[PDB]
Amino acid sequence: SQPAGWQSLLSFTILFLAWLAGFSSRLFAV
Amino acid sequence: VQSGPRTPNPYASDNSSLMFPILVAFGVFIPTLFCLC
Amino acid sequence: MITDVQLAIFANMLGVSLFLLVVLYHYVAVNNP
Amino acid sequence: ELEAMSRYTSPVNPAVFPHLTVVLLAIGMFFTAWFFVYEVTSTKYTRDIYKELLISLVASLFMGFGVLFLLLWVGIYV
């Protein structure tokens, strides 16, 4: 378990959750 | 013009039929996490 | 259909989880350069 | 006649479309996360192609069925 692989997995996960939070906070008019 | 009384759903029965598919999914997942060796 | 309260709770919890993951990333990277 | 036939049931009980989505979507996600990790921590020589194809196949299978059940829970009825 290299910390580089987990570090990159964490980066990908946090970018995906940022995407989803940006998409989900913009539905209060729909 | 008006149809009449609706029909009861003949689909399933509780404690066996609802959880049977979920259990099939679980039982497939576990042997898939066995093909490591 | 989703209500307004459910989606507001969802947005709040997701933002909090985002910032927790930010601080976790900083911790990991600093501790193991 | 319409008298000798039986009323058509769906192959899956509708009230279990949600519970069968998440289970078939969590596992899938899990498998995908196992694939991605494997591709970050592996050098060109060490990588085995068979494990790649096999985990790709299983993750894609569960993810596809889960996407179908999700698509069918929201009300598209493919």
Ligand SMILES: CCCCCCCCCCCCCC(=O)O[C@H](COC(=O)CCCCCCCCCC)COP(=O)(O)OCC[N+](C)(C)C
């Ligand atoms: C939804 C939005 C999400 C944002 C996405 C951001 C992704 C964050 C993760 C990126 C980190 C990748 C790190 C990486 O190098 O992986 C690539 C290989 O990289 C991969 O594993 C994934 C590649 C996917 C690219 C898409 C391909 C499409 C076009 C192909 C024709 C191969 O690495 P290696 O081959 O191991 O490099 C040698 C190891 N060194 C450390 C010495 C470099």
Ligand SMILES: CCCCCCCCCCCCCC(=O)O[C@H](COC(=O)CCCCCCCCCC)COP(=O)(O)OCC[N+](C)(C)C
């Ligand atoms: C850690 C655990 C994570 C495991 C993965 C979980 C992912 C699954 C989450 C998806 C939840 C969907 C929300 C939902 O189902 O609510 C919908 C409301 O329908 C909608 O309009 C919302 C649709 C938006 C959902 C699309 C998400 C897909 C993601 C791609 C970006 C309920 O609508 P209903 O009113 O029930 O419609 C059914 C009744 N009909 C008459 C229409 C048949």
Ligand SMILES: [Mg+2]
């Ligand atoms: Mg059809």
